[PDB]
Design a protein around this ligand. Structure first.
Ligand SMILES: Nc1ccn([C@@H]2O[C@H](COP(=O)(O)CP(=O)(O)OP(=O)(O)O)[C@@H](O)[C@H]2O)c(=O)n1
Length: 366
């Protein structure tokens, strides 16, 4: 939240060197909404190498596209040269704003706090409307992902989508197929944690994006009993659980191994009639919480797990080499079966986790 101050100092430096600079995009939107901006972007008439001259420290990752990350007073500000979008640098602020996605994202602010609003973002912000800048057909052909951003913003801001803009989404919905699935999944992950995400989901159906998103029909579930826990993964679990489907049906969205395992393990738990000590031992607390959260069950899961005789197999007082000695037999897959028998008897509190007593038990059974 010191970002605005840093952006102001960036702007003074650029203007002192004789360039134009302005705050633009979401920070302006968020300011007029009374929020604290999460990121502050600066747009400037300076070219990237000219920016690097004025500040000691910078990151040149986005240089190709006009962006340089300035590091100042412990913050980072993206300074981007006036540009459209395969990237052309333009000479005036308005040429840059004319190509942004929505009126509320298309405003600029001077360091002396004047708002520059050539497209009515002020009014659309007051009236709670997401509306494309200029011709909605052009904005959505420039980048089809904007159709989905419109949906995300409606649930993030509790705005409506301009009628003309929504009809344009319906006409161009099929263009969604050309977007990298990583970008699709990133926006869907944001929808899943939004307040009033149910508004986003209704628009997703009604804009007939669910016809063309990957396995898009699976989003048309009832979302009324869904409340986010801040973790986007829970949205995917909910979806699958409502429809009695498996993780494999959504794999096109390219989940990490962590996400995959968490969804699959949680689904497993919802399929279980009853949970006993062994359940609480084999599944992680995170998996149990989401399976609970989605099945309506409520227990003190941390308390039940805290009370098991052991927490993981690493505390087992025995290993398969102990069983090789005691049995006289040769190492083989049979060890895994017997290690699990022993592990059960310890988790149910029947056998003590003590090598000597386990040895006594093992010789009798073998
Ligand atoms: N497809 C796109 C993606 C971005 N933009 C423009 O990039 C700026 C913010 O991008 P950003 O990456 O910081 C996301 P923002 O719009 O600020 O919302 P958030 O902070 O809640 O994530 C806005 O002026 C948008 O008009 C666009 O015109 N078309």
């Amino acid at each position: 939240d010191d970002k605005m101050n840093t952006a102001i100092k960036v702007i003074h430096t650029l203007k002192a060197a004789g360039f134009e600079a302005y705050i633009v995009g979401g920070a302006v939107r968020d300011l007029l909404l009374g929020k604290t901006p999460h990121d502050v972007d600066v747009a400037s008439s300076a070219l990237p190498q000219q920016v690097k001259v004025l500040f000691d420290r910078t990151v040149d990752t986005g240089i190709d596209h006009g962006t340089v990350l300035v590091l100042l007073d412990g913050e980072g500000i993206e300074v981007t040269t006036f540009r459209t979008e395969s990237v052309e640098f333009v000479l005036s602020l308005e040429e840059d704003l004319r190509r942004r996605d929505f009126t509320i994202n298309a405003m600029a602010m001077t360091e002396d706090l004047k708002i520059i609003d050539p497209f009515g973002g002020k009014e659309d912000l007051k009236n709670k409307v997401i509306r494309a800048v200029g011709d909605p057909d052009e904005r959505f052909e420039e980048d089809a992902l904007r159709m989905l951003r419109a949906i995300r913003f409606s649930g993030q801001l509790d705005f409506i989508i301009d009628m003309k803009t929504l009809l344009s989404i319906r006409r161009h919905a099929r263009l969604i197929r050309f977007i990298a699935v990583e970008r699709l999944k990133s926006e869907i992950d944001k929808i899943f944690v939004n307040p009033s995400m149910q508004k986003s989901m209704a628009y997703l159906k009604d804009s007939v994006l669910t016809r063309f998103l990957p396995v898009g029909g699976l989003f048309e579930v009832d979302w009324i009993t869904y409340h986010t826990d801040g973790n986007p993964t829970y949205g995917w679990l909910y979806l699958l659980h409502q429809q009695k489907r498996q993780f494999t049906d959504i794999k096109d969205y390219r989940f990490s191994n962590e996400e995959k395992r968490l969804i699959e393990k949680s689904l497993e738990l919802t399929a279980l009639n009853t949970w006993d000590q062994w359940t609480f031992y084999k599944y992680t607390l995170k998996q149990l919480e989401m399976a609970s959260r989605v099945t309506g069950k409520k227990k003190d899961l941390a308390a039940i797990k805290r009370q098991l005789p052991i927490q993981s197999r690493s505390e087992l007082a025995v290993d398969g080499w102990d069983l090789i000695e005691w049995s006289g037999a040769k190492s083989g897959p049979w060890l895994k079966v017997w290690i699990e028998k022993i592990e059960r008897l310890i988790v149910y509190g029947i056998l003590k986790n003590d090598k000597e007593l386990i040895k006594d038990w093992f010789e009798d059974e073998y």
